[PDB]
């Protein structure tokens, strides 16, 4: 009864590896590194939509809420995923955005988002420090889909609530599996959700940053693909004004 019920689906629908298409022969300029990150984002977003569609229960939400939750959570989802890829592939020494777009310190400085990169590297190192297992990683990630909503609620709020709880309960089955002592599960859950909450202020600093960059992007030779431009121009101001907020597991 703490054998997982969505875990096999989570493994079968995990997206594969997406390349940025970055030409590594080129200078580490701000224009070149950001153009590739935005391109990598647009490509990842196609994967996130197809994954979210296949996620158990997601297609029960109102079609509009499907759209709102993908639009508000994509940043945290892709940040958390990259952290994990950074940890598995290079042991957190660098931000492994894609195999053809790996950020060392020099790229972190040239991207003009050095302190945000440092924060991502730290999140990446937690996977090592907390010994996050690959099963815990896939259930934690699905939780991040359900972790940011309008202050006023969605069309079918009570349904979103119910799905969120089912993902909290699945992460709990994955915890309780290889643990025998009654109290140990809630202690592991607490360390895991502290980790999920520290994704939220990173995703907020990256929202501010990409919004600020999109409205000046012509001035600095940074290319935003159309889907990304659209979601950021309309949706991100809602997150910046506090119309849309994260659901924290703990007071902050």
């Amino acid at each position: 009864e703490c054998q997982p019920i969505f875990l096999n689906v989570l493994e079968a629908i995990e997206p594969g590896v997406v390349c940025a298409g970055h030409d590594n022969n080129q200078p580490d300029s701000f224009a070149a590194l950001l153009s590739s990150l935005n391109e990598l984002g647009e490509r990842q977003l196609v994967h996130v939509v197809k994954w979210a569609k296949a996620l158990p229960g997601f297609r029960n939400l109102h079609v509009d809420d499907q759209m709102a939750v993908i639009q508000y959570s994509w940043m945290g989802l892709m940040v958390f995923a990259m952290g994990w890829r950074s940890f598995t592939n290079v042991n957190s020494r660098m931000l492994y955005f894609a195999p053809d777009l790996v950020f060392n310190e020099y790229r972190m400085h040239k991207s003009r988002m050095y302190s945000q990169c440092v924060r991502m590297r730290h999140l990446s190192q937690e996977f090592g420090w907390l010994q996050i297992t690959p099963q815990e990683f896939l259930c934690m990630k699905a939780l991040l889909l359900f972790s940011i909503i309008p202050v006023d609620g969605l069309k079918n709020q009570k349904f979103f609530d119910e799905l969120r709880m089912n993902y909290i309960k699945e992460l709990d089955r994955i915890i309780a599996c290889k643990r025998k002592n009654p109290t140990s599960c809630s202690r592991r859950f607490y360390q895991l959700t502290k980790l999920l909450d520290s994704v939220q202020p990173i995703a907020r600093e990256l929202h501010q940053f990409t919004f600020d960059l999109l409205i000046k992007s012509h001035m600095v030779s940074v290319d935003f693909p159309e889907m990304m431009a659209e979601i950021i121009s309309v949706q991100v101001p809602k997150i910046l004004s506090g119309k849309v907020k994260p659901i924290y597991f703990h007071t902050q």
């Binding site: 939509v49 499907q66 759209m67 993908i70």
Partner: peptide
Amino acid sequence: SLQFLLD
């Protein structure tokens, strides 16, 4: 378009 992919 987001909306076309969701479809």
